[PDB]
Design a protein around this ligand. Sequence first.
Ligand SMILES: *C(=C)C1=C(C)[C@@H](Cc2[nH]c(/C=C3N=C(/C=C4\NC(=O)[C@H](C)[C@H]4[C@@H](*)C)C(C)=C\3CCC(=O)O)c(CCC(=O)O)c2C)NC1=O
Ligand SMILES: *C(=C)C1=C(C)[C@@H](Cc2[nH]c(/C=C3N=C(/C=C4\NC(=O)[C@H](C)[C@H]4[C@@H](*)C)C(C)=C\3CCC(=O)O)c(CCC(=O)O)c2C)NC1=O
Ligand SMILES: *C(=C)C1=C(C)[C@@H](Cc2[nH]c(/C=C3N=C(/C=C4\NC(=O)[C@H](C)[C@H]4[C@@H](*)C)C(C)=C\3CCC(=O)O)c(CCC(=O)O)c2C)NC1=O
Ligand SMILES: *[C@@H](C)[C@H]1/C(=C/C2=NC(=C\c3[nH]c(C[C@H]4NC(=O)C(C=C)=C4C)c(C)c3CCC(=O)O)/C(CCC(=O)O)=C2C)NC(=O)[C@@H]1C
Ligand SMILES: *[C@@H](C)[C@H]1/C(=C/C2=NC(=C\c3[nH]c(C[C@H]4NC(=O)C(C=C)=C4C)c(C)c3CCC(=O)O)/C(CCC(=O)O)=C2C)NC(=O)[C@@H]1C
Ligand SMILES: *[C@@H](C)[C@H]1/C(=C/C2=NC(=C\c3[nH]c(C[C@H]4NC(=O)C(C=C)=C4C)c(C)c3CCC(=O)O)/C(CCC(=O)O)=C2C)NC(=O)[C@@H]1C
Ligand SMILES: *[C@H](C)[C@H]1/C(=C/C2=NC(=C\c3[nH]c(C[C@H]4NC(=O)C(C=C)=C4C)c(C)c3CCC(=O)O)/C(CCC(=O)O)=C2C)NC(=O)[C@@H]1C
Ligand SMILES: *[C@H](C)[C@H]1/C(=C/C2=NC(=C\c3[nH]c(C[C@H]4NC(=O)C(C=C)=C4C)c(C)c3CCC(=O)O)/C(CCC(=O)O)=C2C)NC(=O)[C@@H]1C
Ligand SMILES: *[C@H](C)[C@H]1/C(=C/C2=NC(=C\c3[nH]c(C[C@H]4NC(=O)C(C=C)=C4C)c(C)c3CCC(=O)O)/C(CCC(=O)O)=C2C)NC(=O)[C@@H]1C
Ligand SMILES: *[C@H](C)[C@H]1/C(=C/C2=NC(=C\c3[nH]c(C[C@H]4NC(=O)C(C=C)=C4C)c(C)c3CCC(=O)O)/C(CCC(=O)O)=C2C)NC(=O)[C@@H]1C
Ligand SMILES: *[C@H](C)[C@H]1/C(=C/C2=NC(=C\c3[nH]c(C[C@H]4NC(=O)C(C=C)=C4C)c(C)c3CCC(=O)O)/C(CCC(=O)O)=C2C)NC(=O)[C@@H]1C
Ligand SMILES: *[C@H](C)[C@H]1/C(=C/C2=NC(=C\c3[nH]c(C[C@H]4NC(=O)C(C=C)=C4C)c(C)c3CCC(=O)O)/C(CCC(=O)O)=C2C)NC(=O)[C@@H]1C
Ligand SMILES: *[C@H](C)[C@H]1/C(=C/C2=NC(=C\c3[nH]c(C[C@H]4NC(=O)C(C=C)=C4C)c(C)c3CCC(=O)O)/C(CCC(=O)O)=C2C)NC(=O)[C@@H]1C
Ligand SMILES: *[C@H](C)[C@H]1/C(=C/C2=NC(=C\c3[nH]c(C[C@H]4NC(=O)C(C=C)=C4C)c(C)c3CCC(=O)O)/C(CCC(=O)O)=C2C)NC(=O)[C@@H]1C
Lengths: 177, 177, 177, 164, 164, 164
Amino acid sequence: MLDAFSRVVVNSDAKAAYVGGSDLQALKSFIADGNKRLDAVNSIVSNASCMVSDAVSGMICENPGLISPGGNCYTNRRMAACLRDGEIILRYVSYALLAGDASVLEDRCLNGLKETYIALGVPTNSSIRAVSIMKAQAVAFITNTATERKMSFAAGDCTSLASEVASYFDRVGAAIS
Amino acid sequence: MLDAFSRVVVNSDAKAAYVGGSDLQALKSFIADGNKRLDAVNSIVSNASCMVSDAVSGMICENPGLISPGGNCYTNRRMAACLRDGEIILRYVSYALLAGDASVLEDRCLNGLKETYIALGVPTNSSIRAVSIMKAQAVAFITNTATERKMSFAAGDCTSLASEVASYFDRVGAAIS
Amino acid sequence: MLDAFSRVVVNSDAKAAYVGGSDLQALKSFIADGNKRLDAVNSIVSNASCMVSDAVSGMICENPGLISPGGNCYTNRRMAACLRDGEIILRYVSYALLAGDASVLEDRCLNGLKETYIALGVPTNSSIRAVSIMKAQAVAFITNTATERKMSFAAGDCTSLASEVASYFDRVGAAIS
Amino acid sequence: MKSVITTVVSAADAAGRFPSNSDLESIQGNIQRSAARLEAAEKLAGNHEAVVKEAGDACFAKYAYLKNPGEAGENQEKINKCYRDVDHYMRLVNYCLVVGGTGPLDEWGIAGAREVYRTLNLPTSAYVASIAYTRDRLCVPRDMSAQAGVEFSAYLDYLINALS
Amino acid sequence: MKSVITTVVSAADAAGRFPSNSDLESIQGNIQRSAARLEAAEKLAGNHEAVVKEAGDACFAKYAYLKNPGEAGENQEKINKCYRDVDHYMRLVNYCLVVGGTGPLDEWGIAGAREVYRTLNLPTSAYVASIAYTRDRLCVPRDMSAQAGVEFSAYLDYLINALS
Amino acid sequence: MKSVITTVVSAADAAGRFPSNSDLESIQGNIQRSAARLEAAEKLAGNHEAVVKEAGDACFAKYAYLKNPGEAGENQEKINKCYRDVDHYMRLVNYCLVVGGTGPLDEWGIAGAREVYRTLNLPTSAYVASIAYTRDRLCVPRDMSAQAGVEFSAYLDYLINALS
Ligand SMILES: *C(=C)C1=C(C)[C@@H](Cc2[nH]c(/C=C3N=C(/C=C4\NC(=O)[C@H](C)[C@H]4[C@@H](*)C)C(C)=C\3CCC(=O)O)c(CCC(=O)O)c2C)NC1=O
Ligand SMILES: *C(=C)C1=C(C)[C@@H](Cc2[nH]c(/C=C3N=C(/C=C4\NC(=O)[C@H](C)[C@H]4[C@@H](*)C)C(C)=C\3CCC(=O)O)c(CCC(=O)O)c2C)NC1=O
Ligand SMILES: *C(=C)C1=C(C)[C@@H](Cc2[nH]c(/C=C3N=C(/C=C4\NC(=O)[C@H](C)[C@H]4[C@@H](*)C)C(C)=C\3CCC(=O)O)c(CCC(=O)O)c2C)NC1=O
Ligand SMILES: *[C@@H](C)[C@H]1/C(=C/C2=NC(=C\c3[nH]c(C[C@H]4NC(=O)C(C=C)=C4C)c(C)c3CCC(=O)O)/C(CCC(=O)O)=C2C)NC(=O)[C@@H]1C
Ligand SMILES: *[C@@H](C)[C@H]1/C(=C/C2=NC(=C\c3[nH]c(C[C@H]4NC(=O)C(C=C)=C4C)c(C)c3CCC(=O)O)/C(CCC(=O)O)=C2C)NC(=O)[C@@H]1C
Ligand SMILES: *[C@@H](C)[C@H]1/C(=C/C2=NC(=C\c3[nH]c(C[C@H]4NC(=O)C(C=C)=C4C)c(C)c3CCC(=O)O)/C(CCC(=O)O)=C2C)NC(=O)[C@@H]1C
Ligand SMILES: *[C@H](C)[C@H]1/C(=C/C2=NC(=C\c3[nH]c(C[C@H]4NC(=O)C(C=C)=C4C)c(C)c3CCC(=O)O)/C(CCC(=O)O)=C2C)NC(=O)[C@@H]1C
Ligand SMILES: *[C@H](C)[C@H]1/C(=C/C2=NC(=C\c3[nH]c(C[C@H]4NC(=O)C(C=C)=C4C)c(C)c3CCC(=O)O)/C(CCC(=O)O)=C2C)NC(=O)[C@@H]1C
Ligand SMILES: *[C@H](C)[C@H]1/C(=C/C2=NC(=C\c3[nH]c(C[C@H]4NC(=O)C(C=C)=C4C)c(C)c3CCC(=O)O)/C(CCC(=O)O)=C2C)NC(=O)[C@@H]1C
Ligand SMILES: *[C@H](C)[C@H]1/C(=C/C2=NC(=C\c3[nH]c(C[C@H]4NC(=O)C(C=C)=C4C)c(C)c3CCC(=O)O)/C(CCC(=O)O)=C2C)NC(=O)[C@@H]1C
Ligand SMILES: *[C@H](C)[C@H]1/C(=C/C2=NC(=C\c3[nH]c(C[C@H]4NC(=O)C(C=C)=C4C)c(C)c3CCC(=O)O)/C(CCC(=O)O)=C2C)NC(=O)[C@@H]1C
Ligand SMILES: *[C@H](C)[C@H]1/C(=C/C2=NC(=C\c3[nH]c(C[C@H]4NC(=O)C(C=C)=C4C)c(C)c3CCC(=O)O)/C(CCC(=O)O)=C2C)NC(=O)[C@@H]1C
Ligand SMILES: *[C@H](C)[C@H]1/C(=C/C2=NC(=C\c3[nH]c(C[C@H]4NC(=O)C(C=C)=C4C)c(C)c3CCC(=O)O)/C(CCC(=O)O)=C2C)NC(=O)[C@@H]1C
Ligand SMILES: *[C@H](C)[C@H]1/C(=C/C2=NC(=C\c3[nH]c(C[C@H]4NC(=O)C(C=C)=C4C)c(C)c3CCC(=O)O)/C(CCC(=O)O)=C2C)NC(=O)[C@@H]1C
């Protein structure tokens, strides 16, 4: 896996170039804003159970056929698998945010997943809606605008972190469509 | 794997329905005729070596090119494999008859078999003729009409059991054509 | 794997034929010339490190983009893999020469290799040029006409052995094109 | 789907064996015991709505806190999902009586239940209250024969123990 | 196909090694011993029909019961398959003499033989009677040189021991 | 690519865990130490040609035999490949300073180096002479701050020890 820093290194290496001042201002900002990044990751992991639960329940209450017989969430075993997948996806998006790079998500979670869901008959459209709900939750937590819970932060702008985590959630749909 | 009973349960579950009197008369008959089923399975397992031997020898005496060089039964190793396959197939058909359901045969024996035979160059047409001969033998034993051996039974009608085992043997050809 | 002798046996067996005088003169010559074969294999294994090194360096000095960033020999890890592949290929060609038959090379080295190189992005054209250089080196050593080193032999004609090893090297390109 | 048949077949297959006498003899047990369990299954099939209403009612009578804001029965749609879940378990008990084994409970009701109920914050004791109420409400020979009761009660304890 | 060459090559490959001196030295053994075995192979190739007739005849002379109803030589077509099988083994012995190893017997004659002969109720002692008859009928130096006999006899004992 | 981030993420993934406090706390170390290493990286990026010339010159001054027929620096094109290799290592040291870990050296410079240098008959001590020369030529605070020197020197010793 790569992180924000090794990403730049990979790009430089492609041109046999040293990383010097011009390329380093972005990583210098990455570092200067690093406490925000830690806080953003904290606001997600601290609410991860509720996120997954609420997102997968939200997928179902919007499409209640999912829990009819023959629905892909029908039986405890299937419901437990789906909840497990919800948490796995969140866990890898949370790695991507901590690292400032999508490669851990793409390489270890997303690669192979469409084929797998196709093989099992897991509906990729409902999967995308569960993921969109976790996106909505994640942005709320990172910007401390969740309706049912607030956390503690020194006041400041975390728009970029919220945008960035949304791009990671948007990767999951892209890979599985 | 499913058996006759869990088959009905699967079908009912698809409709979120309880299994009640109307659906239960068939399984009640299955039980009332259960000793016959045990006798039918006994008449096959008790003659299984002779069945396989005679069926595979019968395949060969009808198509003696099978034991020419380049024939798929040529060499002891190939003849032993073929005899082994004959017995495996019989063993799974005998499970299907004891269970009153084809799923153990389909899932554990038939799935993957055509591709495998294709990959190895095992001739599926000769395979079907060996299987047809075991079908003929099995029906004879279950109805106590074998020419060379009789077994001991209280007299009664086992037409349905003979029909049913024939349908399991007919599954093997269907899967491998 | 087969050797020169078991090759003849395989061909005879296809016709259910005994191997007798007519077929045996070729294997009798194989044996009569057997010391030459041992010497030819010795002249390769005794120079194998230098062969691989020189061949892979020769591939690169002809196509120096191979060691640019993004080149398939770029980084020590890639250079080490390539050198390793060069030696593997030589090792299997050297088995084929000792055995007087290509089957060990085809079965254990060549089968699967094109797909693998395709999957990894190893350039099959440069691979062929490294192999052609080892061919040139091998023929030189077997005929004691290498420019930089001579070895010790009773004088005689080893044209056939040189031709034969060249045919094994030519198999590698054929398999990977 | 675990049953007498599938257990003996699976074991013979794992050994590469044809059916043999102990396998056939095991299945004779089907022929003896089926009447008691199919009686229970039919009674269940014929009266599940009344059974499930009594069981769900007992859950909420025992645990009125369930109806408080943020708890598992805080509104009518969640309450109805609770009675639905009791109905699902009862249907699976009917399936086990028909199959003669725990397969349908194990596969469709128990596997993953712990994870689901913990994640969704559904208290297990509320499920156990429903199933235990039904086990203790059973009335023999009023509702069915003694051995049909034994079969029915065995699957209810099996599920309780599975949740405990 | 096990031989001097394939044994040493397989061993070097299993170790990731180029051929080395003990490998080449092993193969020098080919160059020394080939004359004796190729003599036996040629004698065999040139006279197999007579050899096989004597061997199959000895089988049935030793075991007349084979010709009884339901036994392995009960009719002419089955009898002819018996002489054919003796011919196959003799052809494989010719192949082993040519290769300088047991590979062709192991692969094409021994592997699966036990299962086949047991399943088809072909008595192993009848095969052994044929092969042993041939081993003991061998006449040196009438039929071939002493070392050609040793090579020929080694493969016949190898097959006997493989069947015993 | 080994770094503070990738080590803690990999470890959490291997355990199926969300990031937790020790993971975030590890990454606070990035925020503290980055200034020293990014100073070294920038100094390197800005002056690598001069550094690499001095290092390659010291290699050949120490080992004049390299320029003899058949040795690794026997002609100008081979000599230039030597300075190029020193430049590659220096670029990888720049990459490690930027990443805050050995990943870029490990992956792109060390892995397979032993095999390559042995096969191509490139003496390791010549590489070590280049890198050690650079480590000992470093001048603090003339060239960079004390802690930038410590970061720079750590990666140079790491590479030396990797080659020894
Ligand atoms: C079914 C009837 C149904 C749902 C279940 C629900 C699903 C849903 N949820 C959101 C938005 C959020 N959910 C959040 C989760 C939590 N907030 C908390 O305080 C706890 C810790 C945790 C779990 C309860 C959060 C933070 C949000 C973001 C908005 C907000 O804060 O109010 C949506 C909206 C999705 C979208 O915007 O696309 C949905 C659909 N809705 C249902 O209908
Ligand atoms: C080659 C010359 C050749 C054969 C070998 C043979 C193959 C064959 N066999 C049948 C029918 C049966 N074989 C049976 C086997 C047995 N009966 C026994 O008593 C012992 C225990 C056991 C093995 C010898 C049985 C029961 C039958 C059914 C008919 C019967 O009882 O007589 C067929 C007919 C296949 C068909 O109907 O499609 C064939 C071809 N025949 C050969 O030609
Ligand atoms: C890059 C500038 C470049 C090369 C590197 C080189 C590659 C190359 N090599 C040959 C031919 C041979 N190499 C041989 C190797 C050796 N001979 C020895 O004595 C030692 C033990 C060993 C390694 C140095 C040999 C024997 C040959 C055969 C010819 C000869 O003996 O002179 C070629 C020619 C390939 C061909 O004919 O297709 C090439 C390209 N050449 C480079 O340009
Ligand atoms: C958007 C994500 C948030 C937001 C975040 C901010 N955090 C700021 C400062 C800050 N936060 C932490 C905690 C963080 N650092 C750690 O080491 C760990 C755990 C190991 C965590 C969770 C620290 C230490 C600091 C530095 C200041 C301090 O000492 O308290 C901050 C101020 C700017 C800055 O320092 O970059 C912001 C904006 N703020 C928001 O309002 C949203 C909701
Ligand atoms: C068609 C398959 C047969 C046939 C079968 C019949 N069997 C009948 C009765 C019966 N058979 C058994 C043996 C069976 N039960 C077992 O428990 C075991 C081994 C564990 C076996 C092999 C039993 C016990 C019985 C019950 C009667 C008794 O006590 O002996 C039967 C009579 C009707 C019925 O009981 O259903 C039939 C028709 N009969 C045939 O003629 C064909 C050849
Ligand atoms: C083309 C490959 C060569 C060439 C080869 C010849 N070798 C001849 C004789 C010979 N070579 C060996 C060594 C070989 N035998 C072994 O047992 C081992 C290691 C175990 C090796 C490497 C031997 C023993 C002999 C037999 C003669 C002797 O005792 O020295 C030879 C003469 C003809 C022949 O015997 O077939 C030739 C032509 N000669 C060449 O000029 C090219 C370069
Ligand atoms: C939930 C929002 C979905 C849903 C999910 C289901 N997934 C099921 C099985 C499953 N999922 C994966 C991929 C997952 N495992 C991994 O290790 C990783 C990443 C490293 C991921 C993303 C696998 C491999 C499997 C099969 C193995 C297993 O069962 O755990 C599943 C069970 C399918 C079945 O019943 O056969 C479900 C229900 N289903 C839904 O309807 C919503 C949309
Ligand atoms: C006999 C009536 C055929 C015939 C059969 C051959 N089958 C050979 C190999 C083989 N068969 C299977 C499938 C079998 N194994 C299983 O485990 C199960 C079910 C669970 C089944 C049905 C496999 C996987 C293989 C390969 C492994 C092995 O050899 O055992 C075979 C050997 C092929 C060869 O020589 O390469 C033969 C000859 N051949 C015939 O001509 C008649 C029609
Ligand atoms: C050298 C002349 C080539 C070149 C070669 C590369 N090969 C790389 C990897 C590789 N090669 C194989 C096949 C090899 N392994 C075997 O076991 C056998 C025979 C039994 C053979 C022929 C495998 C399976 C692999 C992957 C595993 C591994 O890396 O060892 C390779 C690394 C590719 C990468 O960086 O991803 C290289 C560079 N590359 C060249 O440009 C020249 C033409
Ligand atoms: C048993 C030892 C007592 C007894 C108990 C009573 N049960 C009463 C009604 C009743 N019970 C059930 C559940 C039951 N019916 C089923 O079909 C099944 C399982 C298949 C079960 C466990 C229901 C649904 C009902 C209400 C409908 C009906 O009347 O059948 C009952 C009536 C009064 C009451 O509601 O409490 C009594 C008294 N009765 C006895 O005489 C012995 C002592
Ligand atoms: C002679 C000592 C026996 C005897 C032999 C019979 N063999 C019968 C069939 C048979 N034999 C073999 C082995 C043979 N086939 C090969 O491909 C090879 C090696 C390349 C060998 C050594 C096989 C595999 C088979 C079965 C296929 C076939 O029928 O050819 C046979 C017919 C048996 C039957 O139909 O029941 C007989 C009678 N007969 C004797 O009296 C002594 C014991
Ligand atoms: C040997 C110590 C005795 C002796 C034996 C005799 N053998 C007789 C004939 C004979 N032997 C064979 C088999 C043999 N010929 C082969 O080609 C091979 C293997 C490649 C073998 C094992 C055959 C087929 C025949 C008949 C054809 C022929 O005559 O060659 C023989 C003739 C009379 C008889 O049939 O018994 C004898 C006496 N003879 C001796 O002088 C020493 C003491
Ligand atoms: C300098 C201390 C040496 C010296 C070096 C030479 N290196 C030669 C080739 C070479 N070097 C490397 C490692 C380098 N390439 C990379 O991609 C990376 C990392 C990204 C590094 C550090 C490789 C893989 C190769 C082989 C491919 C190539 O030719 O570029 C070289 C030519 C060797 C030859 O042709 O025989 C030399 C001379 N020369 C010296 O005198 C001292 C020992
Ligand atoms: C240090 C304790 C000494 C000292 C050393 C001197 N260094 C001299 C020049 C010099 N040094 C380097 C390498 C250096 N520059 C870098 O940018 C980096 C790493 C990023 C390093 C290790 C170079 C390339 C040069 C020449 C260009 C320049 O002058 O900067 C130097 C000049 C004379 C000479 O060449 O020997 C000295 C004397 N100087 C001191 O005062 C303390 C005692």
